[PDB]
Amino acid sequence: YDSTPIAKSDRIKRLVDHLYAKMPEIEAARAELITESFKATEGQPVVMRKARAFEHILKNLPIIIRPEELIVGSTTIAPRGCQTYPEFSYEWLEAEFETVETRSADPFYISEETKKRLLAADAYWKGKTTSELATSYMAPETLRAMKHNFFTPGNYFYNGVGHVTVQYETVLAIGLNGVKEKVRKEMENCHFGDADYSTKMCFLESILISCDAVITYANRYAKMAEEMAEKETDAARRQELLTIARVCKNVPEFPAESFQEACQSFWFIQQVLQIESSGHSISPGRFDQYMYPYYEKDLKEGSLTREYAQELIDCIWVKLNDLNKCRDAASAEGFAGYSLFQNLIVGGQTVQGRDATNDLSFMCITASEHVFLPMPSLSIRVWHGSSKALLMRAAELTRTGIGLPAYYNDEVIIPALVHRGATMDEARNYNIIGCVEPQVPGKTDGWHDAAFFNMCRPLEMVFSNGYDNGEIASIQTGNVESFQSFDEFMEAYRKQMLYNIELMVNADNAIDYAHAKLAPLPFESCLVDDCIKRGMSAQEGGAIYNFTGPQGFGIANVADSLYTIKKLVFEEKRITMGELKKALEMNYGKGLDATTAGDIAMQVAKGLKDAGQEVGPDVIANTIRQVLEMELPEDVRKRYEEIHEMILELPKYGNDIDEVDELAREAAYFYTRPLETFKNPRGGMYQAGLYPVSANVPLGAQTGATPDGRLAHTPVADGVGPTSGFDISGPTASCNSVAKLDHAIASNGTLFNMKMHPTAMAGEKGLESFISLIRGYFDQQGMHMQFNVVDRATLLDAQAHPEKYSGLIVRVAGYSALFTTLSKSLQDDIIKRTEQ
Amino acid sequence: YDSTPIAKSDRIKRLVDHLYAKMPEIEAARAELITESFKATEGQPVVMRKARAFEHILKNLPIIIRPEELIVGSTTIAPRGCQTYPEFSYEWLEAEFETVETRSADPFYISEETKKRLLAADAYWKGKTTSELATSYMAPETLRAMKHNFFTPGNYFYNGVGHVTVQYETVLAIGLNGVKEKVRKEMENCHFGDADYSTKMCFLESILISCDAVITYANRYAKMAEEMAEKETDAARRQELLTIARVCKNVPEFPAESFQEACQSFWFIQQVLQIESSGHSISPGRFDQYMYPYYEKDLKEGSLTREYAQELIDCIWVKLNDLNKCRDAASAEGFAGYSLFQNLIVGGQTVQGRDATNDLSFMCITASEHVFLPMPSLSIRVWHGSSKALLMRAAELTRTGIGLPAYYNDEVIIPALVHRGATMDEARNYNIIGCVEPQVPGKTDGWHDAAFFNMCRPLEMVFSNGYDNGEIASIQTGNVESFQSFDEFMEAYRKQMLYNIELMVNADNAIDYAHAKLAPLPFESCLVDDCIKRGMSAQEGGAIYNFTGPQGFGIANVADSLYTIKKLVFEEKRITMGELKKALEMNYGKGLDATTAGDIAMQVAKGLKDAGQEVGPDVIANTIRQVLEMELPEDVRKRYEEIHEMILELPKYGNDIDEVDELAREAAYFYTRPLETFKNPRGGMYQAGLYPVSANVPLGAQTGATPDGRLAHTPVADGVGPTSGFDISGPTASCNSVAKLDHAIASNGTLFNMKMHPTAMAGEKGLESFISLIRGYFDQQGMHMQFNVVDRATLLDAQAHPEKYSGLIVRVAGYSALFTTLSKSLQDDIIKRTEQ
């Protein structure tokens, strides 16, 4: 390989500026077309109706070729816009018609005419959505757990599943023509009298229709390019348009004959998957591996230059940021920054077990530097034989502050995959899904972000004996002041965890049934083994590997909390259990907020109503103002303060202190061990992940004060790393603590955020000690690390004067985003993260 | 037991006359109520929607207590009326609004207001019916086979499945209260995190709702009875009404405490099953066995007389004729006479293997004599240890000409059931479903009348090389004149059979998926093992035993046809294959009819249209009149006549001639052996039956002339018996022939019709030789026999003067019917049956 960086074309910046010239906009065409199709296919099998709707959408959806695009394919007329997906849900969106343009997280413009069109189209989907069927399949206890914010399964409730790396390489090598032939060959194994003939053959026919729809789609672009070429006065651009027309007539119907054909074929698959369904984390995976044969052949024949190849890849990077998705306001806070979590990884090992680095490995890193946008979520696989040149080039990218690539440990991930059932050859070919979730590509339906679980809420339930704001919200594990030992408290916590984990399994399994019954996806399925052979969609159990992956939040908070309780209450006896409980209720005497005011206001109102009495707005308004203005007796306030102070002085997780860290390990197991025993309706197993996306901020807002010293309704920790400001012994000590967790059992992936001051990366020696930091953690079986590289003054100035920082990127968690597109509360969370 | 006949109450004749005072009428209330409920439950799981609709129907359906009824429960206000079932299909009914009142088979009155109400209610079901989903799941080749009348799967296409004997004894012993408790106990085995929790628990909750709906229904009758009692001036009737109110408050919620409670509980179950679904052949089964403990206890305590017990049973017999079902005109011709095929059997063996005869066994026979209506389809189990007194009493009933009971052979049926997978204890407890289909009661979803298959149509395809009226209609097995041996012809027939049998499997399996997906039945399911434990409906695979049972038509015609071909064409060479083929086309020179005129007219029209030319009504009208008036050259006509004559002189099936009969056996295997290898989507096997209902007349109308000498479009044989007028050697010889078939492999049941002159039954000696006739057949492993006992003059006079014969019953096939409610073509078929 030749690691010298390839020059950047002047086209790229113009492509980028065009994406961002206007607000993202919501468009109504998809909703109209899916409604139109479904009205015409009533009475037919579900999967055939989905195929026909996909066909109808791709035939009629407005298409556009944006100025100077080499790779074409746009899902909305407005750049960075989105279509809507009423088959999953829509009531949330109609409820936000007047507010979504100016909401605090991921705002979208929507026109008056679009509102009217959505209203008419959506009406059809009332009583037909996955979300409504899912709801009916959830236990009452499950609904209660969600109402009290133990967990949220919103992701696949409101929108599609996704979270998959499909067989891009199959499409490149044999075309959709080849996939159809595979389907037709399987059809020959089916006989009229087979017990599964009706359903198998319907699914197989649905694939044929879906493949021809995508071919049709590509040819619409060829036609548009030809018409544009005819009226193009610029001679060079006209030729570009004519090349586009030739390319789109060949791919993805046929095997790719050139690097540009491979790029265009890839992009059409990447795009239409996200038209078929709104599931995000559609992850390109090992793009440097499967694109390489097409690059190499073009190059060696002299028909392709490195410069044009780089330009094409840069164009794909831009396109990856053109796609978008609108989520309801509450959901959006957990997925903030307009990400689609399209994870693309470089390097690692071949199936043979040799280093996989090639020319494209470096060019993918360069493309991230060239385009400098949030997507794709660039990743690198690190192993003992990694090319040093590739690692240093990755470190160079990280030094820019863009937060890329994220670093993943082959030596832990490969055995974890094998343990969950992959072969060694399969595991060696893994890539990452979305944020940090590993998978065998082209063979898996992994449900890699099925829910967010707040591990602090079961802890709060131990204190409150399963009550929340006066009502029963969980099991009763006992009056917390009756516990005679730390082991008894721990056991109560274990049970609160187990009870609520099982309810989360109920919620996800309910949503699973809803997708299986109402939203099988023939196009996504045909590119995943073994759907064709089994005659069923990936949503029904057709995939070889099936998982459900829900995420645990707050390990640092829980560990430190338990340490506080063990040390100050039971051993040293410096605080009574009752004092601690009451200090937490009163936010350590630091003041009660709007959330607490509202809670108590609602509790007071319910008591009045339950006793058949009037709910006087005067009584409740004076309850609110009272909570907000409450002042404690000075002696009591004083005591809560010194309680807080002695808690903040305790040793904390993230400083290589064994006695704290062992509790982090033990508490993590209360989440990860039960989960690996549960099963899903697709015939696979649950597996815990430990990562936050941006949801640690809203989950923390649902969480009272905790014994680690964290104040009420502030964010919980991001991932498996230490609490901000608590890790005060430098990065090596922090890594040592975090590596004491069992990461491998959390085989849906763990996330370790770290923030470096830019001086840490300075020079070749800076880059080398950076790499050594990562290897030191990986050598202790850590799974993943990723880095912000930025000084505090920069982030504060970007808050005060966003207009100077329109291009500033920060690492959130498992993805990067434009800093000034993030809300103040998320920005603040990122800013207070420990600077090493 | 005490076999003396119990007196008939004067109430019975008045109950009967009331049923028949007016035409059966179609009512709209059910369709309105199911539509109302489904509109309110959109978005919920299917099975929950079915439970809620069943609940809504039973809460609101108009109820009535008819004059003098002791056992109450009516599904329509009009006696012998029907509700409608748009969840399965409705377009056929709307298309018959103007004609159904005066149609030739099973007419129904429908008011102008009912038409309007059905139109409004039905509109909702467009694109939501089982029939539409079934259609989409059928292969194109399957649709072609049906278009050319190889088979019809109409039964479960247009309406519900049924064909089951549910656990009546469970309801009697523990009540629906007990069933609910069983459900709640199974719920305790389900945990929130189980992979099947959502679907299992939804099904179990659906059962609870369905059980409470039926309890509600019964209590509506208690309330109505109380209100009627208050305004009843007749003191004795008032007391009857007050007893009804007490009974309906106890059953079927609670275990039956009296014989009348047992009767009423039974009837409510019999009735509501047929409100939940329009599936017929809901068969009471071994009523003399499970009702007996309730009878005996009442009797021995002195609280019940034999006379009142008989009156109650007579009342149930009347009620069984109050229920009805409207089928589309074409379908109705195959199920003619308003039957619901409610099969009720007496006698047989206990699980211990002793004779099961008891007092109720005789009283059931008496009730058939008392009420003298078509239903129930009374049956008797015959075994080597049968009570001679019960057999003679059965023979006495048969002698009346009512066609009852039908006779079934334990010694063949019990091993056949065991061979298909039942235990010996289960098989010993068998009863009959519908016409002749044996089943282990309370454990089976048997699909016992899944389709009608015309075994003559594949024979016609051998002659025509798979063409029908100029188009390809089946596989091409070769030019029939190229066959060099009889074995080659036989092999061609075997292949025509196999091809079309597999398409029939495709059709039924397609309809199976449609019921599984859109019409699970929680109430029927909860009374069948093992639905509760498995957490799924009987329509999805919850039953322990699962079958599909399609019927083969025309064994006698096929056997004799093959004998003609073997003898006159290949061995003796008295006819050329070409002569035979052409003689058949020309109906042996006996004239071409309206059906042939239409066929050729359509063929001529298609040829013109296919060649892009005009379809002149003059050209087609002259084609019609031409066919109808065609006269053959005299020499050709003469030859066809002598060909017919030498065919009619051949020995025929049904005369104990081995060389003919061996072909009947061999040809039957071409149907029964392939079928036992196919599987259905409920995880069970196909099993052939050989019975016709009344469909041998319309199937014959779809069949050209055959080499047995049968003229074009006349009926094919009924069941496995010989062709009418061909069995000329007396009944023993006929039995000997029919017993050469393999009956046991046709484990869905075979049917043997025989007609006796009344003199054959005269006196004790007549009855005794009757019994010996049956035993002679059963000793040769025959499965079933049933008898008309009537002279020809009676049937002809009933045709000429129906007003003298309003009560005349004849045996059709597997059921009895009022002769003057049958169409002329069916009456004629019954009349020309061989009189022994």
Side-chain angles (χ1 to χ4, degrees), chain A residues 486-503:
Chain A
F486 175 67
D487 289 349
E488 276 180 41
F489 187 103
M490 264 296 249
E491 176 61 18
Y493 178 57
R494 190 190 64 82
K495 291 169 184 168
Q496 289 290 348
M497 287 283 283
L498 186 56
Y499 181 75
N500 282 287
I501 286 165
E502 182 164 12
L503 295 184

Side-chain angles (χ1 to χ4, degrees), chain B residues 379-640:
Chain B
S379 300
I380 182 166
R381 284 179 47 178
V382 179
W383 75 294
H384 71 259
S386 286
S387 155
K388 182 182 170 65
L390 186 66
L391 293 183
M392 290 289 286
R393 184 79 178 92
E396 288 164 8
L397 186 63
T398 303
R399 181 208 263 157
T400 72
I402 200 175
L404 304 176
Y407 299 80
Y408 300 88
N409 184 9
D410 275 23
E411 261 93 30
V412 167
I413 289 172
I414 286 167
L417 290 169
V418 165
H419 180 58
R420 301 316 193 182
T423 70
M424 186 73 64
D425 287 356
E426 286 168 342
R428 264 182 194 167
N429 194 45
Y430 83 89
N431 60 255
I432 295 301
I433 301 296
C435 290
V436 297
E437 311 102 75
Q439 155 190 109
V440 174
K443 297 186 176 184
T444 303
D445 193 57
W447 269 51
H448 293 285
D449 195 6
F452 297 149
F453 185 98
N454 189 336
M455 303 173 54
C456 294
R457 292 247 69 209
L459 177 64
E460 289 190 280
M461 288 307 97
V462 179
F463 281 97
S464 73
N465 194 18
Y467 283 79
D468 189 38
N469 222 31
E471 28 196 356
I472 292 194
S474 190
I475 52 173
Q476 279 55 70
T477 39
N479 191 302
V480 69
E481 294 182 65
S482 75
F483 294 141
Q484 301 289 311
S485 66
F486 175 67
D487 289 349
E488 276 180 41
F489 187 103
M490 264 296 249
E491 176 61 18
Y493 178 57
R494 190 190 64 82
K495 291 169 184 168
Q496 289 290 348
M497 287 283 283
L498 186 56
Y499 181 75
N500 282 287
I501 286 165
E502 182 164 12
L503 295 184
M504 179 176 59
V505 172
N506 183 264
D508 277 327
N509 285 353
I511 296 165
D512 213 331
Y513 279 114
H515 286 281
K517 291 175 177 295
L518 294 179
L521 307 177
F523 190 64
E524 189 268 346
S525 294
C526 75
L527 305 180
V528 175
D529 300 340
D530 251 333
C531 296
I532 283 164
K533 182 177 307 170
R534 294 178 180 178
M536 54 209 265
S537 75
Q539 296 66 46
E540 293 165 285
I544 295 176
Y545 297 111
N546 292 283
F547 304 107
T548 305
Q551 279 42 265
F553 285 67
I555 280 183
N557 306 104
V558 170
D560 285 330
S561 287
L562 294 174
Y563 186 78
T564 287
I565 294 159
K566 187 193 197 200
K567 283 303 177 189
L568 303 188
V569 175
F570 286 106
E571 295 183 4
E572 298 179 12
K573 234 148 298 211
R574 304 179 57 196
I575 303 171
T576 74
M577 186 60 83
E579 287 185 291
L580 184 52
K581 177 184 173 180
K582 180 59 165 57
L584 295 173
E585 291 171 347
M586 297 298 310
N587 198 26
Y588 292 110
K590 305 284 178 169
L592 308 177
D593 61 9
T595 299
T596 299
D599 283 346
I600 294 168
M602 294 294 286
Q603 177 170 358
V604 158
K606 187 196 208 311
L608 291 173
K609 155 77 180 300
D610 285 347
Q613 312 177 11
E614 283 298 328
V615 177
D618 57 289
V619 189
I620 282 75
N622 297 314
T623 298
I624 288 171
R625 189 214 50 120
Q626 173 179 311
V627 175
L628 293 182
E629 288 177 352
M630 179 195 179
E631 33 204 16
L632 292 75
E634 175 62 21
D635 64 318
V636 161
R637 203 267 298 151
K638 203 44 177 190
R639 177 51 171 167
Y640 291 165

